[PDB]
């Protein structure tokens, strides 16, 4: 039962053995029942972590490759190693994507959950776009944008920016516009419009939501300065 | 070629994911070459980290198990036993490599590989069960003994290997044998012997020797306390 797998997931977290935490909540996905926000958060942490480890690896190898571009055979081998990372990273992403697409997004009833998963689909397609090239990149970027926009157009109706999942969307969506669409003016305009829509109510937030909101808004604000700089 | 394997190991180190590092340095070693001190250090970094993540996990999971008051505790146990079987598999994977290739092959090299054997038996000893817990610790103390003899005869007390013996061997004594007196004797001997060369140390190994001695000093404080 998934009730056991929830504890198995928490166990796999505390060990820093996220692969098992993901493998648990993945089978919690295949239950077809609607995840509670606790499970949703666990699954997010799980695959965000498992991908993050490969993202960090990939960026490191990618940098090492670009540092040594004159080095011939060992540059070739560094590329072979790098691709031997990328294929892992991609497999993890296609996993989580198909899991969202065939269970969670089909099921998600809450506007909040709809937003969260449509965001998350966007994110993981971005993490693929960061990897991909060519028409693969084109298609993945397109479907990431589609997923974000679908979430964005929903959350704009369904959530104030006083709720952190909307800010999390606005942050990640803006990072997508800057980092992947190469659209820094679009990125800054999106980020700023989200932030100042948050400023308009920034003092109305509840005890946790203000912490959560402030924790995100400081990233919105700092990205805004990073990009305006 | 060994060189491209060593390079892929280095690359995996730089990427900071070590299982492919260890799994390459293994097949570097199966050539039966004497690992030079660089690939020797890479092999240690690799297997040490690959075990160290499991060690951390095990400590965490054992703590959670102790913090249990059920499927809950059973599950905590079953995950622990998975971790332990991983850690055992990896240690066996190292120890057989040393016995088959490395320990079969200089005093420094002898001492390094023998210490390493000792430590991997010690990390089994953290996890071991049944009467063979004795045979594990025995084979560790056997390796450390051959190491301590070779180093006390053929390593100046400046040598960081010779101190790494005493330090780990004392951790074995205190954590595995609960014999703080046995630990502190060897530790103080090594510490003061290094101080007999405190200014004779090499320009880098000053920091090495003093860091090893700081850890000696702190755990000497523990085991005397």
């Amino acid at each position: 039962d998934k009730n056991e797998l929830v504890q198995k997931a928490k166990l796999a977290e505390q060990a820093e053995r996220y692969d098992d935490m993901a493998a648990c909540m993945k089978s919690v996905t295949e239950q077809g029942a609607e995840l509670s926000n606790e499970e949703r958060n666990l699954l997010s942490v799980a695959y965000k972590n498992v991908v993050g480890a490969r993202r960090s690896s990939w960026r490191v190898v990618s940098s090492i490759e670009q540092k040594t571009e004159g080095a011939e055979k060992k540059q070739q081998m560094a590329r072979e190693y790098r691709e031997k990372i990328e294929t892992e990273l991609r497999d993890i992403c296609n996993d989580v994507l198909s899991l969202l697409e065939k269970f969670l997004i089909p099921n998600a009833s809450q506007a909040e959950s709809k937003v969260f998963y449509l965001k998350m689909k966007g994110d993981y397609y971005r993490y693929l776009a960061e990897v991909a090239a060519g028409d693969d990149k084109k298609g993945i970027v397109d479907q990431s944008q589609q997923a974000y926009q679908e979430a964005f157009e929903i959350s704009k109706k369904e959530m104030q920016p006083t709720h952190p999942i909307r800010l999390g969307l606005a942050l990640n969506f803006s990072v997508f516009y800057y980092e992947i669409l190469n659209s820094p003016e679009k990125a800054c305009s999106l980020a700023k419009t989200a932030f100042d829509e948050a400023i308009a109510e920034l003092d109305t937030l509840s005890e946790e939501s203000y912490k959560d909101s402030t924790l995100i808004m400081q990233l919105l604000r700092d990205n805004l300065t990073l990009w305006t700089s | 070629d060994k060189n491209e394997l060593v390079q892929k190991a280095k690359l995996a180190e730089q990427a900071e994911r070590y299982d492919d590092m260890a799994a390459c340095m293994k097949s570097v070693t199966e050539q039966g070459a004497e690992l030079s001190n660089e690939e020797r250090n890479l092999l240690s970094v690799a297997y040490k980290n690959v075990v160290g993540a499991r060690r951390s996990s095990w400590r965490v999971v054992s703590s959670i198990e102790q913090k249990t008051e059920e499927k809950k505790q059973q599950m905590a146990r079953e995950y622990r036993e998975k971790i332990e079987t991983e850690l055992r598999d990896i240690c066996n994977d190292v120890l057989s490599l040393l016995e088959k290739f490395l320990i079969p092959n200089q005093a420094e090299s002898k001492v390094f590989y023998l210490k390493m054997k000792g430590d991997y038996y010690r990390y089994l000893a953290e996890v071991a069960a049944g009467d063979d817990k004795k045979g594990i610790v025995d084979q560790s103390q056997q390796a450390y003994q051959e190491a301590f003899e070779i180093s006390k005869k053929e390593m100046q007390p400046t040598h960081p290997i010779r101190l790494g013996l005493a330090l780990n061997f004392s951790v074995f004594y205190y954590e595995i044998l609960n014999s703080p007196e046995k630990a502190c004797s060897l530790a103080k001997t090594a510490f003061d012997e290094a101080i007999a060369e405190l200014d004779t140390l090499s320009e880098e190994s000053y920091k090495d020797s003093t860091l090893i001695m700081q850890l000696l000093r702190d755990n000497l404080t523990l085991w005397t306390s």
Binding site: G168, N172, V175, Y178, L219 | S44, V45, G164, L215
Partner: peptide, 11 residues
């Protein structure tokens, strides 16, 4: 007890 040793952003 112890022993021997060996700019963008998102959500």
């Amino acid at each position: 007890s112890s022993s021997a040793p060996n700019r963008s952003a998102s959500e």
